[PDB]
Design a protein around this ligand. Sequence first.
Ligand SMILES: Cc1cc2nc3c(=O)[nH]c(=O)nc-3n(C[C@H](O)[C@H](O)[C@H](O)COP(=O)(O)OP(=O)(O)OC[C@H]3O[C@@H](n4cnc5c(N)ncnc54)[C@H](O)[C@@H]3O)c2cc1C
Ligand SMILES: [Cl-]
Length: 489
Amino acid sequence: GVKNSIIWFRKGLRLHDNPALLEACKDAKHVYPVFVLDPHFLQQKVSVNRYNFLLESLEDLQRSFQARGSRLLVLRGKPEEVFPRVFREWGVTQLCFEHDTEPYAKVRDAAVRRLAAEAGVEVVTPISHTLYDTDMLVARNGGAAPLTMQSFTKLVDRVGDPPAPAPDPPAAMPPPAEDMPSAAPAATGVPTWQEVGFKEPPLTVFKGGETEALARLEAAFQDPKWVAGFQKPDTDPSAWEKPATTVLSPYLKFGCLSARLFHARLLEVYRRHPAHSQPPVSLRGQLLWREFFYTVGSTTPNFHRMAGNPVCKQIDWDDNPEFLAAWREARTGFPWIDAIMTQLVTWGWMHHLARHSVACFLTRGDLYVSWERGMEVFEEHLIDQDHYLNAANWMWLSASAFFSQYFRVYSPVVFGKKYDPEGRFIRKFLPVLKDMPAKYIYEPWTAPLEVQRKAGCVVGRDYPAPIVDHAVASKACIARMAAAYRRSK
Ligand SMILES: Cc1cc2nc3c(=O)[nH]c(=O)nc-3n(C[C@H](O)[C@H](O)[C@H](O)COP(=O)(O)OP(=O)(O)OC[C@H]3O[C@@H](n4cnc5c(N)ncnc54)[C@H](O)[C@@H]3O)c2cc1C
Ligand SMILES: [Cl-]
């Protein structure tokens, strides 16, 4: 005779702009904030940087629910086995969670709705992870998703502004009922990275949580001139003391920051700065790139692979395990490439143009290894790893989809020199080259043997030689891509 609701967290790890949380609290007697954790996830993939980022995001929710008289419940096990138990135990009448469009999510969410229907539980799945209803944009475009960014911008302009961010939850929330067995604090607490099974500590400098996301949002909007005149291709990839972009991707991935709140703050600045940048280079355009890849990926089968993907090109990539290990272990011999790969495993985040260099080097630029193999490396270490975004950009850099200018090959020796001629980005993440003069910091093998010894870095003993000559490798990759683009017909 009362409303007992469950707000199930998967993504959307936040309290602001959470329509699923608001519906769960309205006229609610008891609310159960639940996150389902599988304690056998490492026993099957995931770096300690991203998994601890998720754990720090749950601790942020825990302090937020406790300040409002509630408590976050971290249930162990699988959703299909735990929810039918807590439905009858807690007397649940309504289940609410943010809508997700990932392939594993749809199969998972379909089974839970079945279990909730057999238990008489109402299911409310509002859309708040993306800007718009991605299925509505497909219907408004005649039934198919746009394939070009120019056509996608014309579509979202006809639809209009995204929905406004939902209001904040009340200051006090209905707490979970007391003395419930499955709600015992000893078995529902937030674990640490040592308990889950990781043996190495995290090395990233980015802390998870809604509070840190909101702090990074305000820090970016403290200069409205910088937000308005933001142009993505003009940012600095070598900037590490202060990254050239917002670095809000790990918070938008886990849902620690609402994309609609991000978009709402952008329009406030744009209406006071009439000369603000326009898509696709604007800051608003970057959210559209996220929205554009989500719209195509959710409606494209096998979007994360090559075979069976209707939008990906069937290129005869090489199966070279030696080039993959050198690229994965950051021992390619090119300091600009090895520094970005060291930043991948240390911070779990790199600048967009920095990810352009290593993705072009592995695929259509030098090694000609499949973008699927490098995507497996990024998904392991990137703390902002997004299923649809990591794929469409790996297909962009490999010239398999969306992008088609394979004659444009980044140079692993000159690309980084234009931003950082002294190699400050290289000496930080590759301290073995910290005494190397700037004349040979990007090409250490060209330095004389007297200079290599005087800097404590002899090429071939302390730092590896380049695995390939870029001129020989790039000209070979470009010609093979041309033959690939001629067999497409
Ligand atoms: C090889 C490769 C792999 C990548 N994989 C991912 C991934 O798994 N997850 C991810 O979030 N981004 C990915 N990107 C896109 C891009 O690298 C990052 O979004 C960006 O570098 C993050 O920095 P930022 O948050 O400061 O970006 P900003 O310039 O601040 O952009 C703001 C937001 O817009 C979105 N965005 C920006 N650029 C892109 C883009 N090119 N495509 C889609 N959305 C974008 C992100 O949500 C980002 O937080 C990939 C790109 C490449 C080339
Ligand atoms: Cl270049």
